[PDB]
Design a protein around this ligand. Sequence first.
Ligand SMILES: C=C(C)[C@H]1CN[C@H](C(=O)O)[C@H]1CC(=O)O
Length: 250
Amino acid sequence: KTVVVTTILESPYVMMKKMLEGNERYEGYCVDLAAEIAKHCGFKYKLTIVGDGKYGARDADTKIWNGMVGELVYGKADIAIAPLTITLVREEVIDFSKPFMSLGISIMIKESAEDLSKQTEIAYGTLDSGSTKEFFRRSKIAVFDKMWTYMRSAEPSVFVRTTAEGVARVRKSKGKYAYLLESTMNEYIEQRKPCDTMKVGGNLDSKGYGIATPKGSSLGNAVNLAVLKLNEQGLLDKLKNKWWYDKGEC
Ligand SMILES: C=C(C)[C@H]1CN[C@H](C(=O)O)[C@H]1CC(=O)O
């Protein structure tokens, strides 16, 4: 009937419009994408914000999945449309459509990862949780192994809790802090006032954001084909361009 869509607030994917109710209270790349996939797929839907404000990780002790991944695994939501990175750990428990947006871990400064690793004057870190932190923690690649060893025991802490906190840390560190985040957010922030941040070097890895459904869900096939069609039509490119550049401030 009404498909339950779990999502999360993260600019410019989903934001509260700056007097409204329901789905109209929200706006953003993922809000427009949700309307497009629902249209193609022919379904009615309700956008809900994830209760714990998490993306999805499996607790080491309890072994239960939190965030949006959890809402799908434990049947509280039918689909998740947000900047949810496709990873092997999450793929084992849920289905992802073909990526609707490409990305890679990147470097944000006010060069290369290898350059950051073999240096010591510019501090650097990631979010305290997430796919980016996990990439470093589990990487067998020498350069990233070295970066992780440095980050995990750096005093004071090089980690931050939100994107906004990492961005702020960069801006106020006068060239002494590099923030490792997804290139998508790096590109977005570069077009935001005071226009004082920049992405340097190539990405450290390669993946995408995908629409997620419960393993074996009937909606899966349809949402994947819709993603392929929107991409082919150039719609996903126009949509990223709208929210990143058309709406840029620099
Ligand atoms: C914004 C947050 C916390 C998200 C967005 N995609 C990643 C994820 O799906 O884990 C996280 C960022 C990162 O890990 O650098």
